[PDB]
Design a protein around this ligand. Structure first.
Ligand code: 43P
Length: 210
C-alpha cells in the first residue's frame, strides 16, 4: 500500500530521456545487457555461497529465464541471482552509483554507439529502447521483496511487493512499446539469445508460450 517515489539523479534522467526517444535501430542490445546483469548477480550470490552455503537456502538453482507474454505485452527476465535490498535498488537504479554514466553521455555526444552502454555500467537502461515501463521485482537474502517501477519521465517508485514470493533474485518485467512486440516472438528471442548464451555461464531458458 505504501509507495515511495524518487527522482532519478539528473544524469540518469538525461540518459533515460535520450534512450526512450531514440530511433537507434539495434534495440536488441537490451536483452544482452539484462542477461549480463543477471549473470553478474548470479556470480555475486554464487561467490558469497563459497564461504557461506546457507546463502542458497533461498534457492540452489542459479539460472536465467526469459518469459514472453503476448497477452500482457510483457517480456520478463528472471534470475536467481543475489537480488537487491531496498537500499541497493534505490541506489543502483536511481543513481550514477558505480557507473561511468557521465563518461558515456560524453562519448554519445562524440559519435559513440549506444551498444557501448554496457561498457559504462548503465546497460540496464537500454531496456527503455523497447519498453515504455519497466518493473523490477527483487529479493535479497537480507531484506524483503520489493518492486521498483518507472516509465521514465524522471521518477521511479519503490514498494514492498505483495506479489508471488520469489525465493531470491531479480525479475525485470519489460512492458513493451507497441511497436516492439517482435521481442515476444520465440524466433527473435532465440536468435538474439543464441548469440549471447555462449558467453554466459548459467543456463538461459526461454519459456515458449502455450
Ligand atoms: C535491474 C538491473 C538488474 C540488477 C540485477 C541485480 N540484482 N542483484 C544484483 C544485481 C546486479 C548487480 N550488478 C549487476 N546486477 C539483476 O540480477 C538483473 C538486472 O537486470
Amino acid at each position: 500500500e505504501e509507495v515511495e517515489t524518487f527522482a532519478f539523479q539528473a544524469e540518469i534522467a538525461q540518459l533515460m530521456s535520450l534512450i526512450i526517444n531514440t530511433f537507434y535501430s539495434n534495440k536488441e542490445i537490451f536483452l544482452r545487457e539484462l542477461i549480463s546483469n543477471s549473470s553478474d548477480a548470479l556470480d555475486k550470490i554464487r561467490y558469497e555461497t563459497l564461504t557461506d552455503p546457507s546463502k542458497l537456502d533461498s534457492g540452489k538453482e542459479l539460472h536465467i529465464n526469459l518469459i514472453p507474454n503476448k497477452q500482457d505485452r510483457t517480456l520478463t527476465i528472471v534470475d536467481t541471482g543475489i537480488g537487491m535490498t531496498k537500499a541497493d535498488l534505490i541506489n543502483n537504479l536511481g543513481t550514477i552509483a558505480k557507473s561511468g554514466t557521465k563518461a558515456f553521455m560524453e562519448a554519445l555526444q562524440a559519435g559513440a554507439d549506444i551498444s557501448m552502454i554496457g561498457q559504462f555500467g548503465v546497460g540496464f537502461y537500454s531496456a527503455y529502447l523497447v519498453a515504455e515501463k519497466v518493473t523490477v521485482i527483487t529479493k535479497h537474502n537480507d531484506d524483503e521483496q520489493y518492486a521498483w517501477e518507472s516509465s521514465a519521465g524522471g521518477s521511479f517508485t519503490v514498494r514492498t511487493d505483495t506479489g508471488e514470493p520469489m525465493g531470491r533474485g531479480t525479475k525485470v518485467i519489460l512492458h513493451l512499446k507497441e511497436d516492439q512486440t517482435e521481442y515476444l516472438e520465440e524466433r527473435r528471442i532465440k536468435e538474439i539469445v543464441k548469440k549471447h548464451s555462449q558467453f554466459i555461464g548459467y543456463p538461459i531458458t526461454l519459456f515458449v508460450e502455450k
